[PDB]
């Protein structure tokens with residue numbers, strides 16, 4: 001859902017309901033994250 005920085009519009013894990021939502025000061029913005037990879 002393009003919902004991120006770590007993730008695109010095709011991100012399976014997020015396509016559900018954005019895994020990273022609670023990654024507040026986490027990797028949300030930091031180009032790459034530690035759930036979806």
Ligand SMILES: [Cd+2]
Nearest residue numbers: 004006007020
């Ligand atoms: Cd993400």
Ligand SMILES: [Cd+2]
Nearest residue numbers: 007011014036
């Ligand atoms: Cd994701």
Ligand SMILES: [Cd+2]
Nearest residue numbers: 003004014018
């Ligand atoms: Cd997301």
Ligand SMILES: [Cd+2]
Nearest residue numbers: 020033035036
């Ligand atoms: Cd993630």
